[PDB]
Amino acid sequence: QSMSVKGRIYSILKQIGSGGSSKVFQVLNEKKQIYAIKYVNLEEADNQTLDSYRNEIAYLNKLQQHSDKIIRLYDYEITDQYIYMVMECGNIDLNSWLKKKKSIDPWERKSYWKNMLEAVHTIHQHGIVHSDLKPANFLIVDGMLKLIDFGIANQMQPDTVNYMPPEAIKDMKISPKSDVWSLGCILYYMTYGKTPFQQIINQISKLHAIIDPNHEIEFPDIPEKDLQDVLKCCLKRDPKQRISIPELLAHPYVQIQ
Ligand SMILES: COc1ccc(Oc2cc(NCCC(F)(F)F)c3ncc(-c4ccc(C(=O)NC5CC5)c(C)c4)n3n2)c(F)c1F
Secondary structure, eight states: OOOOTEEEEEEEEEEEEETTTTEEEEETTTTTTTTEEEEEEETTTHHHHHHHHHHHHHHHHHHHHHHBBBEEEEEEOSSSSSEEEEEOOOOEEHHHHHHTOOOOHOOOOHHHHHHHHHHHHHHHHHHHOOOOOOOOOEEEEETTTTOOOOSOSSOOEEEESSOOOOHHOOOOOOOOOHHHHHHHHHHHHHHSSSTTTOOOHHHHHHHHHTTTSSSOOOOOOOOOHHHHHHHHTTTSSSSSSSEEEHHHTTSSOOOHO
């Protein structure tokens, strides 16, 4: 089944994500190369939705320069009815590559963490706060992770409120610190193999736990202390307390050997 984007033509290998009025497809060009293509349908001109999407393209466009830990965008076409974005295709998302795994190599867990921070630092410099980070939002492309999205649009899910931080639940304000927390949970889950409450099931309880000063988060012993320190510093409950992405970038855990 064909597709046209700026008069270049694309044959769909398959759908790889869906949500709202948009679908993502793995696809091939004329010269047998792979790409993802996000196709959004504007027939439902929910006007908040529509500006959310014009805003995502705008940013995705601007962050092409400042980092390649950010998914590449080769082209797009937008009209009143549709939006096609032709992007990079990753081998695999992170959320998967983790569930098909028992032991993560410590060196990889570090290199993925670096990549994580770099990408999140990049979007903070441009004043974006994701506030929705989870493993799905990252993506493997030749050893490097790359952030796929910014939290601008009511995002797809491939084909969970573990990573929800405290401030987002009491506040019913969002700073950068909010992404740190979710990053911690993602690192947490990469060391221990469960987010910090994959084991509470009562949702009313789970969010009382996320916000209960007197619930001591269980921090096991591990081969490397630095990691353990990074993890405690990220999963603090006062944002004013919590470590920053710039402090995180100058941490021993990311800098030494
Ligand atoms: C939360 O929304 C998601 C939706 C779909 C997702 O899955 C995937 C899986 C991929 N692996 C492809 C390899 C395969 F399966 F074909 F073998 C892949 N490659 C490029 C993109 C991709 C690219 C761009 C965007 C995107 O729209 N980002 C916004 C424009 C900023 C999305 C959601 C996924 N994806 N996306 C995902 F991980 C999400 F987090």
